[PDB]
Design a binder for these strands. Sequence first.
RNA 1: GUCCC
RNA 2: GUCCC
Lengths: 775, 774
Amino acid sequence: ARWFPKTLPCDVTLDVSKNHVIVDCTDKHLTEIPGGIPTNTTNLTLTINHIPDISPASFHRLVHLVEIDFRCNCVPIRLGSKSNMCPRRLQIKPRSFSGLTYLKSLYLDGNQLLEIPQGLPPSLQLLSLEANNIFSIRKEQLTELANIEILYLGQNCYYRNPCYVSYSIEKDAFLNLTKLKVLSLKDNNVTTVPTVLPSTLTELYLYNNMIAEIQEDDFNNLNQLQILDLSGNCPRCYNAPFPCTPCKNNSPLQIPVNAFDALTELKVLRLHSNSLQHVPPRWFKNINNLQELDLSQNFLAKEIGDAKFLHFLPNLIQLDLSFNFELQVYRASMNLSQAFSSLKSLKILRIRGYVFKELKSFQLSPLHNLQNLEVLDLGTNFIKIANLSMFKQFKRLKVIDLSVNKISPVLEQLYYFRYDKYARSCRFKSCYKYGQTLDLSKNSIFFIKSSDFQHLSFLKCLNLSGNLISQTLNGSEFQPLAELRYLDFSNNRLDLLHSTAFEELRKLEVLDISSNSHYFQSEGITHMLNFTKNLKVLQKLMMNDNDISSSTSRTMESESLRTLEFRGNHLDVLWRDGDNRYLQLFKNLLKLEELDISKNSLSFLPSGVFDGMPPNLKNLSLAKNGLKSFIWEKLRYLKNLETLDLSHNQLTTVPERLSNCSRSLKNLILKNNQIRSLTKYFLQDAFQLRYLDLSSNKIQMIQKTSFPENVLNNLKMLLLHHNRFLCTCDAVWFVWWVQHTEVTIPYLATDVTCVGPGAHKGQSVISLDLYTCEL
Amino acid sequence: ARWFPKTLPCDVTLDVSKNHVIVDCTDKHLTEIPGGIPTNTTNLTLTINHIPDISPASFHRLVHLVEIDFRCNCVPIRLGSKSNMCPRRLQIKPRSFSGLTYLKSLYLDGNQLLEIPQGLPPSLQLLSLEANNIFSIRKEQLTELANIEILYLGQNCYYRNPCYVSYSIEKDAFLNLTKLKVLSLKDNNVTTVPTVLPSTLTELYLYNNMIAEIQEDDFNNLNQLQILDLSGNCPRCYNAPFPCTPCKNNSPLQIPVNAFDALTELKVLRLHSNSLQHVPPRWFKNINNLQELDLSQNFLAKEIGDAKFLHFLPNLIQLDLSFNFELQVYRASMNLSQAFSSLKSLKILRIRGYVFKELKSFQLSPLHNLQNLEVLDLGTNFIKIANLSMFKQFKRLKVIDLSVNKISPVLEQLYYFRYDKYARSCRFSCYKYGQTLDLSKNSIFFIKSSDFQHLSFLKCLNLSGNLISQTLNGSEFQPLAELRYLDFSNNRLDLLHSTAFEELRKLEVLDISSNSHYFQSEGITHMLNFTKNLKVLQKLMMNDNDISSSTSRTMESESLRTLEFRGNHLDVLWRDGDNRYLQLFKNLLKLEELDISKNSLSFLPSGVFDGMPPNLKNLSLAKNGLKSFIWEKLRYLKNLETLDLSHNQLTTVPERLSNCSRSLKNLILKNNQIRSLTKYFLQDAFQLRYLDLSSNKIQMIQKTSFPENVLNNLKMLLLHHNRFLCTCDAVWFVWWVQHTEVTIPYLATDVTCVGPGAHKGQSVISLDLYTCEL
RNA sequence: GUCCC
RNA sequence: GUCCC
Ligand SMILES: *[C@@H]1O[C@H](CO)[C@@H](O[C@@H]2O[C@H](CO)[C@@H](O)[C@H](O)[C@H]2NC(C)=O)[C@H](O)[C@H]1NC(C)=O
Ligand SMILES: *[C@@H]1O[C@H](CO)[C@@H](O[C@@H]2O[C@H](CO)[C@@H](O)[C@H](O)[C@H]2NC(C)=O)[C@H](O)[C@H]1NC(C)=O
Ligand SMILES: CCCCc1nc2c(N)nc3ccccc3c2n1Cc1ccc(CN)cc1
Ligand SMILES: CCCCc1nc2c(N)nc3ccccc3c2n1Cc1ccc(CN)cc1
Ligand SMILES: *[C@@H]1O[C@H](CO)[C@@H](O)[C@H](O)[C@H]1NC(C)=O
Ligand SMILES: *[C@@H]1O[C@H](CO)[C@@H](O)[C@H](O)[C@H]1NC(C)=O
Ligand SMILES: *[C@@H]1O[C@H](CO)[C@@H](O)[C@H](O)[C@H]1NC(C)=O
Ligand SMILES: *[C@@H]1O[C@H](CO)[C@@H](O)[C@H](O)[C@H]1NC(C)=O
Ligand SMILES: *[C@@H]1O[C@H](CO)[C@@H](O)[C@H](O)[C@H]1NC(C)=O
Ligand SMILES: *[C@@H]1O[C@H](CO)[C@@H](O)[C@H](O)[C@H]1NC(C)=O
Ligand SMILES: *[C@@H]1O[C@H](CO)[C@@H](O)[C@H](O)[C@H]1NC(C)=O
Ligand SMILES: *[C@@H]1O[C@H](CO)[C@@H](O)[C@H](O)[C@H]1NC(C)=O
Ligand SMILES: *[C@@H]1O[C@H](CO)[C@@H](O)[C@H](O)[C@H]1NC(C)=O
Ligand SMILES: *[C@@H]1O[C@H](CO)[C@@H](O)[C@H](O)[C@H]1NC(C)=O
Ligand SMILES: *[C@@H]1O[C@H](CO)[C@@H](O)[C@H](O)[C@H]1NC(C)=O
Ligand SMILES: *[C@@H]1O[C@H](CO)[C@@H](O)[C@H](O)[C@H]1NC(C)=O
């Protein structure tokens, strides 16, 4: 169907709207720019390769380039792979870019460059030099950048990439970059704000440096500035998981009261980890548009109880005051200033790491009439006491987050303590939707009763994951939660003695009781898995990793359940050969469409398992079972089966004729098995098939009878990589078909490979020339 | 060093004291008996193979066989592999055993046999026919067994191997087996005790059958019987994890009051799962020697409060009354009869599954003066309340077991609920420190010193699997002045204070594994230098804690010999460019064993090895995804004896091992990506004694890499599952493997050529390379 | 591949 | 293969 096979080891995409020819060679183990890149290429990505040099030959024919992404072909040693260290810094010979008359974006991050590359064309708008070894900025090296708008220079001198000196910037180095809008000098050992900066700046990043003082005129001319980040100058170093040097004498970053007066457009001010003890109101006199203020990791514990500056912030959207606790102090309560009541626009308030014992309703009163408040984050506070009923005054909120506390009767897991939360990777550049969420995960709740939730009937999602709840539920414990749609009960010690557990939650749509294995791990104890009958609108049930090997009831029943996750249990024991009692465990889940019984140690499936499946089953996973055999003809019982996942097993054969096993099957996943050959008529007349994964098997040969053309051209995707293809003359049809097909087959360039014979070992089949088979 | 390579795919051993030649072909994927078995073989084991028949040719030459173990060459379908099902039952041709004039033991279990094989020699003492399809025993088929002493016929008719009829035994079938001592008819669908049995019987196994009634004379003549097991006749079926049919009408197994009167020698009586509601004292009138009584899984809840029969058991050593609870009843307390006080000899008492809310000191008083009592097991009782101080009255005990309860302020994990605890396979802990209180798997959320009042005698305390989410500061275990072992795993320890555990001044072993909770939340203080105060601590386990951060930079101890640090995040702690924790273990000055496997260490930053403590002997770096390894840094480890690098991604070995470590004895490199050895790999590495290179991708090994003066002082050399290329370049290695005295496992099954073409899949031990010498 | 799984 | 790991 193709006349010219594509052999370039890069993905090529056409977006004819934007006249873009997109060539993506990311992570192709290239040691040179491959030949044959399209002459019309506009976006070329070569990030993560080991191309040791650039020269005028590099992009000779590619005059239409608007973007070159040439990152991380020589990453600094501590930042890069230790198994494939870059032996030499990238070399850029003269004139490699001056021909690129339309080049607007150049990324040379992560190449151990020692200087700002010269000869760049005046069309350039974005230059990125992060994670190089450039630590002295001279005005002369910048004259070439007259039209630059975006300039990334950070991560060139810090602990993961040291330069052993202070960063140097010549006076007015940037002043004549009259279009410069974004300047990033983060993570660079900078000691002062460089001046004078061009007044076109909209975003200025100076965080993670060694700036001890702001001069009162450092930002005098920046009347267009919208984002300013000075964080991590005079850091708060307690429990830092990176080497951290504080300013002497516990001093804060010193900011004159009038330092921000020019910044009338400022929307984002980030003052994280500046060891601040006070926030002067005078800072915000002329900033009336501020929307985001980060004051986390300072020493503002007492200031939070005073906080006059909040009176100047009526348009603030987000406020972060996390991790301001005084060292070795466990306060009795949280003292929030009445001034918080003037934050009329506030949507998001975070005060993690304040560290206090008892939360009481009146302490949140400054927040009662914040009418736009959506998120209240009081996580990681070691709170021991909290009457949850107090949140009856907060029904307008979307998320109340008390995660990680000690209460008893979506940010990354590293967030406040990582070095640079916004740093780029070499590679690239949850129940809230249900309604009001109370997040009590990772607390010390050992026993629950109905009155714990009094006045919380508005809740839609309750997260109790990771508490200590070791209790037989009998339907009395959640009685006030009449509107709850989602309960996360995972990582507790549920004791399913009663089939009435959870039945008070009459609107429940999703229940997670995964990782409640404790009572399932002790022999002779009663478990009622038929508790589903009472939950009349339950759509999704997760009971993964419960180690379930026994059940007192023999059937689960539901008129509503659509999805059951049963991964990580012991159906192999429940379905012990000769024991027929549980072969219909799921049969009466009459609306069940999705069943995950992967990781159940099912080395074989006893007869009756498929007949015992509920009638509308569409999506079945049997992955990661150590399955060693499979009677494909039993799929005939699964009359609505569309997706079958058999990945990561030990199958050695496929059925003689897939179409004779299932008339409905669309998606067949067989990756990571032990298959060495296909049957002669494998896919004959399998007209419903749309997706086939045979990757990571041991296939040597595929003949045309197995893969008829009228089935292949209906496939959305066919995965074949990481097999054991033998590239002899017996393989001519398969090699020809692979080279010429339009069917999507991923990894042709790197993992659809010959293992033999001798000559062709390690060769991609897409490049294979078999003319000698036709002489 | 050998003149004749052994190519027989079986292990052959000589024990010349007993004139035994032991040939073990277990699980060799054989489809025939191999030729060339030693003519002098006395023990031949062929278990787990697919040999479809036996004939006079089978053992022609093996006149000296005393034992044939030919089990499981055709196992019943529900018991056997579904990926390699046996297609047809083992065929035994006539005259196959009659020549075996010295044969004393024949195991034919698991072969789908339909009848008792005939033509067996008169020397036979033991015959085993378990897991076949023999369900009718006729006296004529047993005449050949005149001299038999041990006869195993069980598992021929039960739910994993049905016969669809009742088992049949002819009247007096066994009577003329005048030397028969052990008879097992378990798991067989038997409906009555077969009579008359020979009076030589010492052991009679009739459990897991369908016997509804004992006749008063069923055991009349059995005056030598020492073990009788009638369990699982009229089973208690509640929560049975196997298909279970109870006797009709809720009846127990019906046993007349005098049924045991002849059994004067009886030592073991097993009446597990007989749905008994009463235990008549009259049963034990004439049994004065009984030592073991199993009454678990009956309905004896009310009998336990009465139990007059215990007065007749002054020599009982072991008593099991577990799982006798009444259905749907949660008793307030445990009512133990005073009659328990007459069990003068009792060492072991187990009452799991009695099911009661509150354990109370006076409830145990009948046990106060049982002076040989060693184990009290009250696990799985859903006890909510128990003052632990009550065990001040039980300091003589070795184990107090309250595991699996709900207390708050060594039997397998399947035991009382498995179908047959004693069934055979086809193929075949802190008590030692002293008084042990097992509180594992309860609901303890908070501990304080008074919880342990009067328990200073305890040597081992098990708190694993509780709910303890608490900062310890050294005040919580003050009375436990003698404790040597604390299992604190699977809780939520909060190491805020470096004074944690310092009150346990006799502590030698501390397990705080799987206390990851407080370690996985960022910004929290953790004091890993808490070891400094524990002056006699030998072993510390802190596996699976997800430790990625620490407030202190060094752990210190003068005593610790063993640290288990598996399943943490030293990769994050030792982030490249952060030097602060590179001496975390340096000041564990007596540390000999360090397990830092499963730490995501894809590389080791420079300084990790210099930071190791000086006496390190045994280092595991397994399961780290290690991609590179600067072998020369092993020079820092001057006492290193064992290095475990298994399950990583290493691709090379050092150019010269001897230049990396003068001390290294054991190098484990299995499951890596090594494709070739360096030219002089083991040159002059005379200290090396154990080398595991299995499951790599080695194609070729030459003598320069593997000098012989090093190889033959190796206790073991593991090479299986590689990618050996068997060309004429391999002539030295093939010869050396064929002729070496060094132990190399799996030669018969996984030391294999992958090429070239001709030799693919061929064992290197069988390889003939004469064409390389033409 | 008799119990486990 | 810049932050994660
Ligand atoms: C940031 O700059 C400081 C100096 O301003 C560097 O510190 C010097 O480091 C050298 C070599 O490590 C020492 O010999 C000097 O004594 C240091 N000088 C001072 C004034 O402390 C520091 O190394 C730089 N940081 C990074 C990450 O490169
Ligand atoms: C044990 O023996 C009983 C009979 O005593 C078997 O039960 C019969 O089984 C067949 C086939 O399942 C039925 O058609 C009969 O109706 C049954 N009869 C009665 C009276 O139950 C039973 O199958 C045997 N058990 C085993 C494990 O083989
Ligand atoms: C060995 C006992 C098997 C049956 C069982 N299972 C459980 C269980 N999963 N949780 C319990 C929790 C508290 C008390 C008893 C049980 C219990 N029990 C005992 C029990 C169950 C039910 C009742 C009636 N509420 C009384 C007692
Ligand atoms: C964001 C807090 C980091 C420091 C820290 N770590 C912990 C910890 N591991 N457990 C605690 C348990 C209770 C109270 C406070 C802490 C605590 N804290 C705060 C704290 C620690 C110590 C003290 C003095 N007892 C008071 C307060
Ligand atoms: C291509 O490059 C241009 C110029 O920098 C950029 O605006 C655009 O987003 C890029 N598109 C893709 C798909 O890489
Ligand atoms: C809260 O703290 C502020 C400042 O420390 C103080 O003005 C105020 O009185 C305190 N309020 C309470 C209730 O402690
Ligand atoms: C919690 O507050 C609610 C609502 O104000 C009140 O009804 C209840 O008494 C309080 N509960 C406790 C245990 O203090
Ligand atoms: C509940 O919180 C846990 C623990 O933080 C989290 O992993 C989980 O995704 C949350 N569940 C939902 C449904 O948001
Ligand atoms: C359920 O248990 C709760 C808590 O023990 C109790 O208040 C209630 O009486 C029980 N209800 C039923 C119907 O058993
Ligand atoms: C669940 O099954 C048990 C029988 O094992 C029965 O007692 C109970 O009533 C059932 N419950 C429901 C809700 O079906
Ligand atoms: C089938 O279910 C799996 C969950 O295991 C899901 O990830 C996948 O997208 C589903 N596929 C289809 C085609 O619905
Ligand atoms: C499978 O193929 C045979 C032969 O064409 C046909 O008789 C049979 O009905 C088919 N079965 C199914 C389930 O398609
Ligand atoms: C060898 O066979 C004899 C005869 O049954 C037996 O007594 C002995 O224990 C067996 N030893 C081994 C190691 O198989
Ligand atoms: C403590 O009990 C646990 C849980 O039953 C068990 O796994 C562990 O081996 C015990 N510890 C010791 C030291 O015996
Ligand atoms: C440790 O905590 C206990 C618990 O209340 C307390 O009695 C004791 O004073 C504390 N010890 C120290 C040294 O702080
Ligand atoms: C452990 O280190 C911390 C500081 O990192 C110190 O406060 C504490 O006293 C030390 N404790 C011991 C036992 O060394």
